[PDB]
Assembly symmetry: D2
Homo-oligomer: 296 residues x 4
């Protein structure tokens, strides 16, 4: 299969006066490229995909594609939906705009059955000829793509090559790779990047890498080179920031951290997301003190 693996960043989407700051966005993607990232994920969960318009979705993908031109860095575009017809259209659109692959979140809110999830992803995979990464985050969606459904999709659909797991369940990661060792398991939970990689995971889609792209890329590349000692050392050092970046719902902490570090101009979200509490604002600032944050 064609795959998209390695160190990847779920890009935040900076706002300026309520609009997407397109210049800041490209600047941030170039900063990821210059710090060893292998792929960028525009308009994922961390990018506030839920509150962007379809045109903003396209703008972010196009900027990502344009900024990665002439580099090895791939664009794995977020294109999920709770409606299969919309997810198919979003997958096709992302392919139009030049994306290298698709990240497709499991349907949220409507809690489809495993049979429904299979038909959902089959339709998406059959609509394009680029790689498709499943995305399991039951804490957000209210549903879980079971191991059996993931493996069936991997084996039955040419484009589907793995899953981004954000479920806090290392047992499921063992289950997945013990029964289907050919799939690409991608960590969607920064604090446990190293345990997923050390079990045969092949990449991360990281929130923390927005702030510390050099450290996350180094961790991932050490692990991929089977230098497990050095990968674990970075994972252990990153634990404090990895956890504080979820003291409130992502991406509220990571955007707060990017603002405190001077990497974005304004601490601006789109409702229903908003600024953190003053206490959590201060807690994030404290945790950042121990880390060296790359500039532009």
């Amino acid at each position: 299969k064609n795959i998209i693996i390695g160190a990847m960043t779920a890009l935040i989407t900076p706002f300026k006066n309520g609009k997407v700051d397109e210049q800041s966005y490209a600047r941030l993607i170039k900063r990821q490229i210059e710090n060893g990232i292998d792929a960028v994920v525009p308009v994922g969960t961390t990018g506030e995909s839920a509150t962007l318009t379809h045109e903003e979705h396209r703008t972010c993908i196009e900027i990502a594609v344009e900024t990665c031109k002439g580099t090895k860095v791939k664009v794995l575009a977020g294109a999920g939906s709770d409606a299969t017809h919309e997810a198919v259209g979003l997958a096709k659109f992302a392919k139009e705009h030049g994306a290298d692959g698709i990240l497709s979140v499991a349907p949220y809110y409507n809690k489809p059955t495993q049979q429904g999830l299979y038909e959902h992803y089959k339709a998406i995979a059959q609509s394009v000829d680029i790689p498709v990464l499943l995305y399991n985050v039951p804490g957000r969606t209210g549903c879980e793509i079971s191991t059996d459904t993931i493996i069936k999709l991997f084996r039955d659909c040419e484009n589907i090559y793995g899953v981004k797991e954000a479920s806090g369940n290392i047992d499921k990661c063992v289950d997945l790779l013990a029964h289907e060792p050919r799939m690409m398991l991608i960590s969607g939970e920064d604090a446990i990047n190293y345990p997923i990689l050390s079990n045969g995971g092949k990449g991360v889609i990281s929130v923390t890498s927005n702030l510390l792209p050099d450290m996350i890329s180094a961790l991932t590349h050490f692990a991929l080179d089977e230098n497990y000692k050095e990968a674990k050392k970075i994972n252990d050092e990153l634990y404090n920031i990895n956890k504080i970046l979820f003291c409130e719902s992502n991406p509220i902490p990571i955007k707060t951290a990017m603002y405190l570090a001077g990497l974005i101009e304004s601490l601006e979200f789109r409702l229903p997301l908003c600024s953190p509490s003053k206490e959590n604002f201060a807690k994030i600032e404290e945790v950042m003190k121990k880390y060296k944050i790359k500039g532009f």
Copy 2:
């Protein structure tokens, strides 16, 4: 406050050849009206709001408004979204399409903080001058509107008049009405309709009432008259069907039952929803035999 309470039905959305069956939809609402229902909820969770287009959202609301004209039955239109700007637009559309009130689900997937939830609903409430009922279903959304946030919204916003609770948490129902006895607590979980009403709840938004509107109507009106003995009797008799209607994710079982009862032509869903398993199809059919299902 202006309120919409009593026995209410979360209307299923019948499909025919991939399209909303507009004739069937009106016929089902008329059947609800003729069996003692006090309000209907077009395009809620049970109505597959996630997979309908904006045009189909508009059409279902318009059919409900037109069908309820000249009756006492109110239209409480589903108008929630995980994007505040989108929820505001849907609320304004429902008011302009003639809805009597709004049912607004808590933002799904992006997990806003309580502060974000407050600002989200404040913006919705200020955009219209019709009643707004909050809707808490953390099993589907991944977030919980806290009692403090519900009570703050009730006291701060004139049009927010209560909450549809679908959280299986009777402790919270006590918490809500002990600290704010003026709000309208509405049961969003059929199996525990009677316990919520007996604690001072003033209505239900029911899945079961699609199939058994006369029984749910009788249950609610018995309870509202403090005939708790007769209300509990109906709630107990309904437990088996109330539970089997969630053997798979709602609305898969209720649509299956409506099809088995001859109330809809086609057992059609929009992906990622699909037909139940063969075993659950047979279990739903068996449980239905205990109950007298009104026709048209």
Copy 3:
């Protein structure tokens, strides 16, 4: 069946210099009797049964039996264990010491299957000729007596007459009484005493009644007479104290409250239980100021 229902108190066990304060214990029981309580539960969870010796178990049961003599008040002795051979011995023990019935918690820690739970309680019930109340508290035991297992035990074992439910699950309470309306469902969760009673529950085994026995007794008798308005009023008024009495693991808050009220001489627990933090000590003290606490 022979039953023990009504307003019942899970008695705290006061300590003085590391030993059971036997005079205080008797005086506290008399105070419960004089404030309308229908039965007392020595050496339940609230009585720190886990850290008492078998000799101290006997002493508490004997004091309860002797103090209730010549009154209508029954003694429902705690007699559970995670070992069936030990639970049988404790049940026979309590019957021999003159207890009117036994409360037998589901086996903790070793997580028996439903079949094992059935055989466990069958063995206890066949060992005595006094009523047996099951006790489901999965948050403490790590296991759940299913509705099916409870109903089978009620129907198959003559002395098993109901269950004390401490699971926060009003759906299960509907399930239990809809399928077996002859059983005695007893609330083991103070905050939701009224909802359980209004669905046909026939008593409470209360923590709060240690502090406010007159209020819990009145709530229960209002509810048993279907004076739901009055019962709900008390339940709502009690919500704040009902919740603060679990700000730390019971019986740490209730013993703190009893000490603050002057009802026990020393705030002494047996390890691993200990004094609350200073912040929760102050929270309990503040909440108590809203309630009228009866003396001796």
Copy 4:
């Protein structure tokens, strides 16, 4: 600190006509020694400690100590209790009976606070001069030893050297070893033995090793020698048996497998534990056929 690490077995306790089969117990331990195990754990959870008498506790510890004498295999005796005074006595008795260290489960059922857990284990640690391993299994105890409490106990008490984790929470494993890399984190959940070891865990206390001691000891020794490829291979191969051994509550499946393998004479438990369902009996038998089971 003095430590007990490596591949360890939570020994089942075979019964014959209701009594501990002492000859079988010795035979099974010698079998563990012959297949590379580094320590044995008599009368843990897997050993049905809850239903053994004090005299049976001593017999099992004495048989383990004598069978391991003159070998390098250590005896890590189960000595926990929900009562601190009892846990202190059990620790002293295990020491007197010749154990090399103690495994002390967190108090079950009574749910002590973190302050209470600290004082509980401090009292245990001060009562003996042999190593003490904490044991966190919240699914059984209803309480969790927090990372902060574990680390404080490790730093404040000379005998306390690590924790057996059975919580399915690899995030906590990173948390523990990132903040206190000197502690001995021991896997108490077979399915994730390799992920815990690859993050710096230093041993396992295994259920599966009762049946497959050679495979578990090799997995552990591969991992400790930093041969992660071979450790993961065994962990992946063992996943099916690792999961089926918990299709019902441990130790019901492992005793069933040991009986099916001919390693014990009778499939006898002490109530409330009992034989598995006929369906799970067959599933266990089917899974076992894929594995080479060492004899005596």
